[PDB]
Structure formats: structure tokens, C-alpha cells
């Protein structure tokens, strides 16, 4: 009180300063780091992809070309309902990993749907969420090798499980790498176009989807992620102004 109170204020006032400096120091580190949310269906090669990308929630930190990236994977919940998705609003992009090989496979309980159809429904639910309006998606159509073997010399046919395969005609404009049989090309392009159909339905130009084809043993995934993040930021800046 009186003279005594002034005494507390100078230390307290020194005290607010001691903190503010640390907050200013931490802000510079916080701004640079880019956060990616990793999400996908069970048994879709998630651990293999995350391991090859770099040597209840799991966070992995890595750097590429003097740029810091931070990754989040939240498998603990095991929940069909999802209100933890509300938190992930500030993420730069969402990595979605889906197993293309498992078309002729059955979810264990109720025989309600094929594994792929459930993945398509999950992607549709995520894409149209109200909170995730301005967040882009990167697709890794994993298990590419198995799909070729299941299509060539395989008793199972895409026609029975997916009736629309007969009506679909593969575009001759797009071509695979040399040496691939046309049949596997038709299979993969059917798998990709199906996702793109939901992707382009209600995008409105704010957020886009980048479909990639990946396999288990590869190292070029991280470069793909870096390039896609660069493109996402460039497109966001271009749309922020009136140019695009």
C-alpha cells in the first residue's frame, strides 16, 4: 500500500516483460512450421508410408530444404463419429491414405459394404464438412502393386463389385509408364476418377485434391509432399488477390 504497493508493481511489471520476451521468441518458431494432418482407413499401409517418408496421438517432426514440417496422426479414438475433427482447422493440408487393392474385400461386421466404398463415404464426409471448407487433400492410392496382380490372372472382376466399370471408357490422352498392360491402367484410372468425381463436385475453387499413385517401397513421397504444399500455398496467395 502507499509506497509499499509501488514496490510490487515494478517487479510485477518487470515480470510481465520477462514473459513477453519469451512469447516473442516462441512466435518466430511457431510461424515457420507447417502442420500436416495424416488420416486414413485401417490397415491401409499407414505405418509403412509414414516410415518411408522419414527414417493416442503420434507426432513426427522432419525437415526438408531448411523447412520444418510437423505431422499429426490420431488413431486412438477408433470412432465413426468424429468431433475431434473440429480442432484441425489450421492444418496446411490433409494426407489421405487409401488402399486401392482392397476392392474385392469385406468389412468384418454386417457385410454392409466393400472396404473401398466405406473409404469413399468417409472421404465424402470429410470433404463436405462445414469446418474443413478451405483445406486441401492429398491422396495416396496405396497398394498399387497388389491391384495389378489381382486384375491380371485374377478370378475377381471389377465388373461384379463395381457395375459402372463396363460403362467407363479409359481416356487415351493419359498414359502410364511404358511396359504396363492396358488392363491395369484401366483399373487404376477407374479408381482415381471415382475419387476425383467427389473431389470436383462441390470444391468451388477454394480447396483442391491431388491424386498420387504410390507403392510400399519408395522414397520420392517426401518430395511430392513438399511440392504439393508449395503449390497449395501459391494457389492460396493467388486466390487471396484477384488474379486467380
Amino acid at each position: 500500500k502507499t509506497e509499499d504497493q509501488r514496490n510490487e508493481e515494478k517487479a510485477q511489471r518487470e515480470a510481465n516483460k520477462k514473459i513477453e520476451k519469451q512469447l516473442q521468441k516462441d512466435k518466430q518458431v511457431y510461424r515457420a512450421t507447417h502442420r500436416l494432418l495424416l488420416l486414413g482407413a485401417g490397415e491401409s499401409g499407414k505405418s509403412t508410408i509414414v516410415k518411408q517418408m522419414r527414417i493416442g496421438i503420434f507426432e513426427t517432426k522432419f525437415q526438408v530444404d531448411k523447412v520444418n514440417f510437423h505431422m499429426f496422426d490420431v488413431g486412438g479414438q477408433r470412432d465413426e463419429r468424429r468431433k475431434w475433427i473440429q480442432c484441425f482447422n489450421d492444418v496446411t493440408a490433409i494426407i489421405f491414405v487409401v488402399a486401392s487393392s482392397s476392392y474385392n474385400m469385406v468389412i468384418r461386421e454386417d457385410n454392409q459394404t466393400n472396404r473401398l466404398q466405406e473409404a469413399l463415404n468417409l472421404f465424402k464426409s470429410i470433404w463436405n464438412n462445414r469446418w474443413l471448407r478451405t483445406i486441401s487433400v492429398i491422396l495416396f492410392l496405396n497398394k498399387q502393386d497388389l491391384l495389378a496382380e489381382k486384375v491380371l490372372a485374377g478370378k475377381s472382376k471389377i465388373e461384379d463389385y463395381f457395375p459402372e466399370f463396363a460403362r467407363y471408357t479409359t481416356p487415351e490422352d493419359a498414359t502410364p509408364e511404358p511396359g504396363e498392360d492396358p488392363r491395369v491402367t484401366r483399373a487404376k484410372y477407374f479408381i482415381r476418377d471415382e475419387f476425383l468425381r467427389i473431389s470436383t463436385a462441390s470444391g468451388d475453387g477454394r480447396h483442391y485434391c491431388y491424386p498420387h499413385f504410390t507403392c510400399a517401397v519408395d522414397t520420392e513421397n517426401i518430395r511430392r509432399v513438399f511440392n504439393d504444399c508449395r503449390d497449395i500455398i501459391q494457389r492460396m496467395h493467388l486466390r487471396q488477390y484477384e488474379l486467380l
Binding site: 510461424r31 515457420a32 523447412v67 481416356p171 476425383l196 468425381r197 473431389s199 470436383t200 483442391y208 491431388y210 508449395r230 503449390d231 500455398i233 501459391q234 494457389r235 496467395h237 493467388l238 488477390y241 484477384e242 488474379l243 486467380l244
Partner: protein, 287 residues
Amino acid sequence: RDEVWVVGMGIVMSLIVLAIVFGNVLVITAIAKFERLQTVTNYFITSLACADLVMGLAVVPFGAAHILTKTWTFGNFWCEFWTSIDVLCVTASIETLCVIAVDRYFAITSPFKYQSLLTKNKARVIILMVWIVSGLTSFLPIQMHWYRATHQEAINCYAEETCCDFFTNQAYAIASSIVSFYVPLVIMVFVYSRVFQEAKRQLQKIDKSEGRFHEHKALKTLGIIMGTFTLCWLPFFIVNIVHVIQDNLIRKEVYILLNWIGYVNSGFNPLIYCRSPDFRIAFQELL
């Protein structure tokens, strides 16, 4: 007659002054009052708005009466002061435009390194530097006798207090023109060319990626930005360079007309550089 010419010009100069001051003060108040519009980029915009507000409040009025009266009433110290204010404002605005263009270029072409390079404290240094550079070419020679030349007709109006007019030697005119206009112009051209190339590349990539399921915006956005500035400020500097080199080629009335054409560009800047929806939302709140 004199009634007809004086009356009509009265309805135009007043409208110009009111429009300039209203637009600039509205932009400044919108930036100052609301914390949402506070951003690193908008500091350059508010600097431009402040400079154009100063010019509209100061040079347009006194200059307007000088042509209409056909005589200058204020004394010798204020003719020089008004000339210095004019040069200061023009240079500051034109250079702030180039600063904005460079900031946009860095934001677009280097997405990852944009956040580290430009900070709140860094922008203040650039704005202070550009204002000091503008002041150096404006006040220092005008306050001194450097701007004055030796032409006979000129010696008179520097001796007589009745005629306030601008007579300069070749060196100062050329130096001021190069410092103010051409160097920012080449920079803007290169910057906008690179930015347009980047936008075209991105559009081509998106069309290749998703063309089957689904250039006017870029040309509309740039064409406006470059064309308004070029139309407003290009003729004046070229005629300013010419009239010194060639004797009696350019009449005084045409020189004054082009100078006044250059002035009106200040009013257009709030429209061009504040079309964002956030600016619209805020204006509704106060208005």
C-alpha cells in the same frame, strides 16, 4: 463568358477535392479503427492514403485559385513551399506504389520464405526510408537556389512576387524525373510480368489436372492496375523532359493540363487497392 468558364470549373475542382479527401480519410479510418484489417501489407496502403490525403488537402486548393485568379496572392516564401509540397507528395505516392508491387511479388513467387523476410518492424524501416528519399529530392534543392535556372523570362518571375511559376534547368528536371517515375516503372513491369507468368503456369497445371470434370481474371486484375497508372502519369513526365530539351515546343497551358491530369490519379487508388470483401464489410459498419 468569364462567368461561364469560372462557374463550370468551380463545380469540378470542388468535386475533385471533396472526392479525394473523402476517399482517403475513409480508408485511413477503416484501417485505424478495426483490428481485422491490421496486416503487414496494409501499412503500405495507409502510407499511400496519407500521402494522397496530404496532397489533396494542400496542393490542389492553392493551385486551383492560382489559375482561376490569374494571379498569386500569397508571398514569395509560400510559392516555394507549395512547390516543395507538390514534389514531395507526388514522389512519395509513386514510390509507395512500387513498394506495394514488390511486396506482392515476394508474397507470390516465394511462398515459404515470405513469412520470415517481411515483419512488422521491417516494414516501418522501408516506409521511413522511402519517405526520407522522397523528402531529399523535394525539399533540399527547392529550399536552396538549385532548382532555379538562368532563362531571361525566368529571372523575372524569381524577381517579381506576382508570378509564381516553375522554371528549372535541365539537370534537375532530368534527375527528378528519373528518381520519381522511370525507375519504379521498369520494376513494376518486370514484377508484373513474372507474376503473370506464375499465374498462367498455375492455371495450366490445374487445367491439366482437372479439366475434364469442370485468363480473364488475370488480365482484368493487371490491365487495370498497370493501365490506370500509366495513363495518369506517363504523358506528364515525358513532356516535362521534352520542354527543357526543345525550345518553345510545349505550351504552358498543355503543361498545366497534364500536371492536373496527373493529380486526379490519387482519387482512384482507394478504389483499385481496396476492393477486398473485408474492406467492404467494414465500410458498411461505419457509413
